[PDB]
Amino acid sequence: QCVKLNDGHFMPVLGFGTYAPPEVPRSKALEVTKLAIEAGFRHIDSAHLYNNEEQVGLAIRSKIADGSVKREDIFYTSKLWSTFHRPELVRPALENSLKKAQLDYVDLYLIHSPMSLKPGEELSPTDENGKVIFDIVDLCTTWEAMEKCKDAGLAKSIGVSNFNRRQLEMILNKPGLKYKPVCNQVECHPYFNRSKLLDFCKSKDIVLVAYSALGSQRDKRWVDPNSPVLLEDPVLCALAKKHKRTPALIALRYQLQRGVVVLAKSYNEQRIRQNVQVFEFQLTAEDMKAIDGLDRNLHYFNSDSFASHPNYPYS
Ligand SMILES: NC(=O)c1ccc[n+]([C@@H]2O[C@H](COP(=O)([O-])OP(=O)(O)OC[C@H]3O[C@@H](n4cnc5c(N)ncnc54)[C@H](OP(=O)(O)O)[C@@H]3O)[C@@H](O)[C@H]2O)c1
Ligand SMILES: O=[N+]([O-])c1ccc(S(=O)(=O)c2ccccc2)cc1O
Numbered sequence: 355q356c357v358k359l360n361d362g363h364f365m366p367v368l369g370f371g372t373y374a375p376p377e378v379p380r381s382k383a384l385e386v387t388k389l390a391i392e393a394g395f396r397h398i399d400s401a402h403l404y405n406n407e408e409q410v411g412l413a414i415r416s417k418i419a420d421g422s423v424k425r426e427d428i429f430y431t432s433k434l435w436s437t438f439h440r441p442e443l444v445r446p447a448l449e450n451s452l453k454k455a456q457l458d459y460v461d462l463y464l465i466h467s468p469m470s471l472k473p474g475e476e477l478s479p480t481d482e483n484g485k486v487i488f489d490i491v492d493l494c495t496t497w498e499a500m501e502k503c504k505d506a507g508l509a510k511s512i513g514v515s516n517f518n519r520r521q522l523e524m525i526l527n528k529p530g531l532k533y534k535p536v537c538n539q540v541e542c543h544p545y546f547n548r549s550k551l552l553d554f555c556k557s558k559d560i561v562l563v564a565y566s567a568l569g570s571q572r573d574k575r576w577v578d579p580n581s582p583v584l585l586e587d588p589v590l591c592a593l594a595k596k597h598k599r600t601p602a603l604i605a606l607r608y609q610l611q612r613g614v615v616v617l618a619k620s621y622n623e624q625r626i627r628q629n630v631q632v633f634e635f636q637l638t639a640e641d642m643k644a645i646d647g648l649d650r651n652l653h654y655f656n657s658d659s660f661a662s663h664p665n666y667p668y669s
Contacts, residue, residue: 355368369618
């Protein structure tokens with residue numbers, strides 16, 4: 355199942371999340387991406403940040419070589435990291451990602467975040483207090499460099515991630531805009547359902563792609579351990595019982611029925627296969643209203659590291 359993007363390309367509506375934190379051996383990304391493709395995932399979400407593009411690209415190429423899929427059947431995303439927002443760094447960052455994955459093109463290239471970081475060797479250049487050292491880049495200039503990557507054929511489609519409405523607006527209002535973003539990949543789940551941003555995106559034919567749709571991996575670098583655990587929510591668990599599915603499947607299905615493309619990360623073979631069951635059942639209107647009731651403005655990523663960045667998207 356795919357949605358048509360505003361530049362005519364197609365995005366599968368369920369995607370596999372590939373991030374795992376640095377304690378997880380790098381080889382695991384190769385194994386679990388092949389599992390995801392075997393289970394029926396066709397959209398695969400990676401990034402420079404993830405330090406896994408080589409393993410994820412090998413898993414794709416393995417499944418092409420063994421005859422399981424064709425390249426045109428796979429929708430592969432990577433993302434421009436925030437130390438590469440200066441326009442002359444954008445096509446190089448993309449070419450690096452293509453070389454790591456050994457692919458000729460990515461289906462989608464995103465600006466990973468609006469929170470530009472000091473250019474240099476470090477992924478996360480940190481000040482005195484562990485705040486990211488910010489850079490000031492007009493992201494409209496970064497966008498123009500993204501458009502040139504599409505014109506060169508390095509990315510089939512281009513989009514953004516972690517933009518708020520006003521930051522998206524800034525791009526859509528750019529003089530001489532050539533390509534709208536096709537999507538805005540953002541934190542989105544029943545505790546932070548982004549209904550206003552969703553309505554804006556739909557008005558502009560921009561796909562909202564939900565990450566941390568299962569509640570995030572609750573990494574201690576970014577996530578308060580006190581934050582309620584999404585999949586323990588009693589309304590999600592009651593709906594799981596009513597449908598004889600699981601709280602994760604309820605959270606994924608919720609998004610599809612709102613018109614949201616949804617990612618799901620799992621490094622567990624059973625849960626990878628379980629997550630494709632999202633296409634096998636439906637939530638009723640009352641189930642969806644119950645889930646809408648859970649909204650509490652909770653973005654799990656909530657650290658000082660970035661909450662003080664001048665382009666921090668949350669307010
Ligand atoms: N653009 C950005 O800034 C950004 C930010 C965050 C994430 N992302 C992308 O979005 C992807 C997904 O988000 P996420 O990594 O935060 O994780 P997530 O999809 O919200 O999943 C959270 C946790 O759910 C568990 N899980 C998966 N399926 C389950 C099931 N059926 N039942 C119970 N638990 C289940 C997984 O644990 P197991 O592995 O143990 O199954 C996983 O660690 C990322 O991997 C990345 O691709 C992008
Ligand atoms: O789990 N991931 O996939 C992932 C983890 C961390 C970040 S981040 O840029 O630190 C960030 C920081 C703050 C808010 C949003 C994003 C990007 C990611 O994509």
